Design a protein around this ligand. Structure first.
Ligand SMILES: N[C@@H](CCC(=O)O)C(=O)O
Ligand SMILES: [Zn+2]
Length: 261
């Protein structure tokens, strides 16, 4: 109701993407995606004006164990470069310790992406074998999941992953997909089911989600501690949930324009 709200987001399909013609557009009109639509609904239910900005270091948010600094969208909120994050940003404990999250707007889990035909059905399968390399996004909740897991199978996978040479990790999702596509069934990618399910409906239609999800978690809208936005945004997400907006949006951006029939 007083100041333009600065929004940190990340270029990640289908959440935030450059519009074909963006170079001829100004401001928020540059971008399109599920999070852009969601930003707009949240902004009008809460009554604020906003500026979309893409995170500077193109990352999600992790705390460096020696430096102690938060990078990613999280750091932008921690250090006060942004007022709010509207992104496929996973609700985790170490983040919820330093920022607040709204209730989840998307439910998801860690899943496996394979090039179609790869003889893999599950995480147990991957752990039990050696021909097919597999990794995660370099920085993010998927990598931490494996880092911290006490469960045999995921420990076994982490043990392999962190020592694998050359690196099984990737700077971006799109980097992970491309490596799956290019690697003849010899790389499998570990990513949240949402992104898996999106790519699966994307040409050349050569990838696929196998098996069950490895976990159950959420993406949440993040705000810095003490923000006057915390409560109105949490309420808006619930309103958008209850009225079916979040299902319309997921359908719009995953399935309405799916290329694999
Ligand atoms: N959504 C994740 C990033 C993607 C991933 O880690 O697989 C996060 O907030 O860290
Ligand atoms: Zn509305």
């Amino acid at each position: 109701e007083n100041k333009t709200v600065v929004v940190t987001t990340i270029l990640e399909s289908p959440y935030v993407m450059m519009k074909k013609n963006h170079e001829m557009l100004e401001g928020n009109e540059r971008y399109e995606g599920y999070c852009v639509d969601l930003a707009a609904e949240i902004a009008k239910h809460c009554g604020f004006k906003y500026k979309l900005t893409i995170v500077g270091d193109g990352k999600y948010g992790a705390r460096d164990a020696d430096t102690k600094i938060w990078n990613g969208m999280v750091g932008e909120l921690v250090y006060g470069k942004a007022d709010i994050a509207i992104a496929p940003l996973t609700i985790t404990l170490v983040r919820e310790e330093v920022i607040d999250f709204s209730k989840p707007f998307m439910s998801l889990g860690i899943s496996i992406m394979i090039k179609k035909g790869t003889p893999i059905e599950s995480a147990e399968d991957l752990s039990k074998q050696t021909e097919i390399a597999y990794g995660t996004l370099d920085s993010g909740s998927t990598k931490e999941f494996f880092r911290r897991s006490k469960i045999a199978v995921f420990d076994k996978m982490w043990t392999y992953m962190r020592s694998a040479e050359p690196s099984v990790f990737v700077r971006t999702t799109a980097e992970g997909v491309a490596r799956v596509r290019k690697s003849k069934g010899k790389y499998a990618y570990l990513l949240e089911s949402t992104m898996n399910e999106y790519i699966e409906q994307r040409k050349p239609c050569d990838t696929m989600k196998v098996g069950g999800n490895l976990d159950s978690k959420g993406y949440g809208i993040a705000t810095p501690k003490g923000s006057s936005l915390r409560t109105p945004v949490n309420l808006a997400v619930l309103k958008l949930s209850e009225q079916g907006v979040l299902d319309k949006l997921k359908n719009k951006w995953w399935y309405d324009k799916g290329e694999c029939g």
